Nucleic acid binder design. Sequence first.
DNA 1: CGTGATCGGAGACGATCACG
DNA 2: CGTGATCGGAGACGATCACG
Lengths: 175, 175
Amino acid sequence: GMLTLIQGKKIVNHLRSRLAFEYNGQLIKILSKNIVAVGSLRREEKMLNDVDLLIIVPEKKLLKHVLPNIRIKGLSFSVKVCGERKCVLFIEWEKKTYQLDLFTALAEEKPYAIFHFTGPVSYLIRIRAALKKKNYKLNQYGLFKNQTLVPLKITTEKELIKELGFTYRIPKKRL
Amino acid sequence: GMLTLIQGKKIVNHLRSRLAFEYNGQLIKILSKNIVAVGSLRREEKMLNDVDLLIIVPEKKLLKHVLPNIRIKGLSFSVKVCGERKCVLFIEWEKKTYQLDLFTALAEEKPYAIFHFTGPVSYLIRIRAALKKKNYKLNQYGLFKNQTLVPLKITTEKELIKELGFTYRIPKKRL
DNA sequence: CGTGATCGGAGACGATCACG
DNA sequence: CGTGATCGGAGACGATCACG
């Protein structure tokens, strides 16, 4: 279902403290630090068909356990599909049902992933096509030339966009 | 069932003219030239539990079609198991049932195969163990050193046995 | 010593829908 | 442009018996 951006912010603010995964029986929570609102929500659209968040896992081994054992404090939800990298929830928010998408990225790959998951799709098609015609492949995980990772001395998404050879835009003016 | 060597010779002499395979619907016969009596029959034992023959296929592509489409002129038989390299028959010979084993070898590999299929097993265990302790592997198909075929300028089984570093013995005095 | 034929069961693999 | 999750179906692969 669709929801306003204001409802979206309220929903996200609720979840920031109430997400967790169980690791061999014990329940570890995800810190707000490692939760990033993305998708149409970060683009600040008036209407949203889903709520997308991206969770930063600080260790590669934990990808096994985070999304497939995701838990939400006191909130009814069903699982649509779920793997190690993408998890789609149907959440119940005040007697209504909204689609909630979760995704995972490790620390090394955080800037590349934030750029991918905020979009929009048309914006990235044009960016990756431009880099495709210089023999580059760019994905959520990194930038590649000859099946090899290109080491960019970067940290933020903003430094990445400029290092790829385009001007940084606030997310809400990417089209 | 078991049969005398004299019955064995009579059985083999019958088959030499009456074996054939169908190749995409047409029935091609195997020439006596390319049929070699092996096993305990070649060792000339008094009693045999089977009749083993080895058929030389003059082209690698025909391995698909020879044994799996084997035909015997006017003789009742059932198939026990059958592949491209080994075929085991239950033949009916004068109101009795005898096991008939067929095997295939290409021209390149004829001497190595004749040495394998006449045996006996104890004789080859000792020969191949001796070559194993000089980093050689010998099989029905060739002699190998470092996963590579060893090119022996040989033709007959007798030249092979001497080139491997052992004296030739008539088949009936191999133990 | 070294390989073959057969059985049966798993795991990449293409097709499909989905994610930004 | 580039990848993910899921379904379902095939083909090497180990175990077993067999071949000299």
